[PDB]
Structure formats: C-alpha cells, structure tokens
Amino acid sequence: ALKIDNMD
Amino acid sequence: ALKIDNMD
Amino acid sequence: SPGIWQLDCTHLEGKVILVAVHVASGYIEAEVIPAETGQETAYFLLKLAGRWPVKTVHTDNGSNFTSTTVKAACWWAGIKQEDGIPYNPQSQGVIESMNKELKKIIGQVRDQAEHLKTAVQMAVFIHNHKRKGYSAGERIVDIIATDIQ
Amino acid sequence: SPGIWQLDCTHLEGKVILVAVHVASGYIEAEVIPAETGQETAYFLLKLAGRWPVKTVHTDNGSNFTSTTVKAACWWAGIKQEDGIPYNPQSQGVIESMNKELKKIIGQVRDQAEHLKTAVQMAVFIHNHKRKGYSAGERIVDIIATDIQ
Ligand SMILES: [Cl-]
Ligand SMILES: [Cl-]
C-alpha cells in the first residue's frame, strides 16, 4: 500500500 | 479469571 | 529518580494512546488500544517492567489505581503502584504539552503509515531521539547506568 | 557492539514468538503474532528502534531480509538491515538454547496468564532481570551508556 508498515 | 492479565 | 514512571492516556482517531513517561528523562513508550481498561493497562506495565527497571508507577486515573488487574500486574512485576496526583502543579502542564507534541508528530507522519499504531511508534521514535544537548533516550540510559554504578 | 541486534522467531501454541536479542548483552524484547510476515516484522523493528539505539539488525531468515516492508521500516528508523548467517557457528547454539530457555519459562508461568502474550512478557521480564553478577538489563544499559560517554 506504499506505507512503511505495508509497502504493498 | 484470577489471572495476572485478567483478575476476573 | 531512576525507577519512577508516570502513565498518561490520550485520545486520537477514536482510539486511545497509552503512554508511559520516565519522569527524570522524558523518555516514553506508548501503544494504541481501542479503549483504556485495567486489563490493557496491566499488560502494558508488564511489558514496560520487562524492559526497564520500573520501581514506581504513578497511575493516570483512579480507575487504573483501583483495578485489581493493574494491582496484580504491579505485584507480579515488583512495581509500587502509586496515584498520579499533580502535587507539583507544573506536572499537568508538562503532560499536556507532551500529548500536544505527540499528536503534532503523529499528524506529520500519519500519511506514511497505514495503521495509527505505526504512526504512534514513529512519534515515539522521534520524541526519544530528539536532542534538547542529549536526547531523552540518552538521558534515561545515563540515569540508569549511574544508578547501577 | 552497542547497536547490534539479532532477530529470532520461535513457535509455541500454534502462534509465533518474534524476539529481538541485543547481541552484546543478551537482553531481549519479544512479541506474539499469529504468523511471521514482513509487515509484522517491520512494525516490531520500528518499536524496537524507538526504544533502543538500533544500528544494525541481523534478520532471522531470507524472507524478512528480502521483504520490502522490512526494508522500508529499517530505512525509516535508520537501521542497517543485514543477514543473520551464523558466521560464528556458536550463534546457532546460543539462539537455540535461548529459545529452549524461554519456552521453559513460559511453561512455568503459563497458568498465571490468560493469554500467551502475557506469559511471553513474563518470560522476557525473568530473562532480562536474571543475574548471571549482572543481569542482561544491567549489561545493555552499561554498554550503551559507555558508548554515549
Ligand atoms: Cl477509554
Ligand atoms: Cl510463520
């Protein structure tokens, strides 16, 4: 999700 | 529950 | 000095952020929970006392002071559970200004995190690494190491 | 020295216990998750780096070494993400003996806790406070304070 905690 | 993390 | 911590509970995004502050250094640890209960507070203090040498905790409100489960965790971990009455009036202000600063930081990082709990740990990191010049993470290690020696 | 940590993942009760070991002291932090994923490992490292000055982490397997989410958390927190190949063969044995010891302690406390995660935090507490005589909690503070000065 392009987040540090969920790069998907 | 008489447990340290749940005394009920 | 070295073993005294204070609990603090603030709200954001419809959830609760529970914080433990090491009073002498300003170093903090925090977690996000859906609501503050004795059971969650007790588990949080068990985590804290396995990580730092926690002698006394000033609880954040009378419900967590009274809670049998918080008392059980404090007994298990060898912590003196105390009230958190601001006998020194400057204390209310210091905690309030901390919660304000933590929420500011959370807003600054919030778009880098899917979950609030990630943003709160980013805020914990920035708070504990900021130099004031030593940081609060430096000051708590120095204080505890001085106590050990 | 002061900033090197190693990840370790062990299984109990159908769940996973993720552990970070500060290599020079033997101090540990741990959590229980339903299964080891890059996202959970990344969040765990972000917590750890907000609490201690983590310079390098030796990851526990090639999946968490490769994970883009673990790489992102390590970039965010300023950690050098490394492999955890036991170039010193004595390492496999030290980690394995640690997992055996932690499971033994979990078993000894397990009936005082409703949830496994509480028993694991009780084991973390007993492990970090045990005097070997200094405890691992004393040694990690000693080591980091010496580094700061
Ligand atoms: Cl609440
Ligand atoms: Cl797994």
Query: Any idea where the domains of chain D sit in the sequence?
Result: 1-149
The encoded tokens of residue C45 equal 């203090």
Resolution to 1 decimal place, in Å: 1.7
User: How do beta strands C80-82 and D27-33 pair?
Assistant: unpaired
Q: Give the CATH architecture of domain C1-149.
A: 2-Layer Sandwich (3.30)
Q: Best residue in D125, D129, D135, D146 to probe C by mutation, most C CBs within 10 Å? A: D125
Beta bridge partners of C12: C15
CB-CB neighbours of D47 under 10 Å:
22
Q: Tell me the shortest Cα–Cα distance from D113 to chain B, in angstroms.
A: 5
The encoded tokens of residue D56 equal 């390098």
Residue D30 to residue D28: CA distance in whole angstroms: 7
Q: Is the dihedral of CA C132, C10, C44, D16 positive or negative?
A: negative
Amino acid, res. D31: E
Check: CB of residue C80 under 8 Å from CB of residue C56.
Answer: yes
| Burial annotation D105-140 (CB, 10 A radius, 16+ → b, else e) | bbeebbeebbebbbbbbbbbbbbbbeeeeebbbbbb
Cα-based angle D56, D35, D14 (whole degrees, multiple of 5): 125
Q: Which long-range contacts (CB under 8 A, 24 or more apart) does C122-125 make?
A: C122/A4, C122/D46, C122/D50, C122/D76, C123/C30, C124/C28, C124/C29, C124/C30, C124/D47, C124/D50, C124/D51, C125/D46, C125/D49, C125/D50, C125/D77
Amino acid, res. C107: G
The encoded tokens of residue D93 equal 């044995």
* C21, C27, C33, C35: CA torsion to nearest 10: 20
Q: Choose among C115, C93, C91, C104: nearest CA to C33.
A: C115
Residue A4 to residue D103: CA distance in whole angstroms: 32
Q: Is the dihedral of CA B6, C2, C4, C6 positive or negative?
A: negative
Is D147 annotated as a binding-site member? no
Q: Helix, strand, or coil here: D131?
A: coil
Q: Helix, strand, or coil here: C134?
A: coil
C79 DSSP 8-state letter: P
The encoded tokens of residue D54 equal 């983590």
Q: Which long-range contacts (CB under 8 A, 24 or more apart) does C60-63 make?
A: C60/C6, C60/C7, C60/C8, C60/C9, C60/C18, C60/C84, C61/C9, C63/C36, C63/C38
| Burial annotation D48-87 (CB, 10 A radius, 16+ → b, else e) | bbbbbbbeebbbbeeebbebebbbbbbebbebebeebeee
Q: Best residue in D33, D69, D74 to probe A by mutation, most A CBs within 10 Å? A: D69
Q: Do D73 and A5 touch (CB under 8 A)?
A: yes
Q: Helix, strand, or coil here: D18?
A: strand
The encoded tokens of residue C93 equal 């202000």
| Burial annotation C115-148 (CB, 10 A radius, 16+ → b, else e) | ebbbbbbbbbbbbbbeeeeebbbbbbbbbbbeeb
Nearest CA in chain B to C76: B4
Residue D121 to residue D133: CA distance in whole angstroms: 23
CB-CB neighbours of D43 under 10 Å:
25
Q: Say whether the A–B interface has 3 or more Cβ pairs within 8 Å.
A: no
* Residue appearing with tokens 């200094």: D134
Is C83 annotated as a binding-site member? no
CA of D26 to the centre of ligand 2 (A): 24
- Residue D12 exposed, middle or buried by CB count within 10 Å (0-12, 13-18, 19+): middle
Ligand approaching nearest to the C-alpha of D34? 2
Q: Specify the length of chain C in residues.
A: 149
Residue C124 to residue D43: CA distance in whole angstroms: 13
Dihedrals phi, psi of D75, to nearest 5 degrees:
-60, -45
Elucidation technique: X-ray
The encoded tokens of residue B1 equal 């529950």
List of chains touching C (3+ CB pairs within 8 A): A, B, D
CA of D46 to the centre of ligand 2 (A): 19
Ligand approaching nearest to the C-alpha of C63? 1
Q: Best residue in D39, D68, D71, D79 to probe A by mutation, most A CBs within 10 Å? A: D39
Q: In chain C, which residues touch B (CB < 8 A)? A: 38-39, 42-43, 46, 68-69, 71-73, 76
A–D interface: beta-carbon pairs under 8 A:
20
Q: Choose among C99, C59, C55: nearest CA to C77.
A: C55
Q: Tell me the shortest Cα–Cα distance from D8 to chain A, in angstroms.
A: 20
Check: CB of residue C24 under 8 Å from CB of residue C4.
Answer: yes
Residues with CB under 5 A from ligand 2 (ion): D 16, 35-36
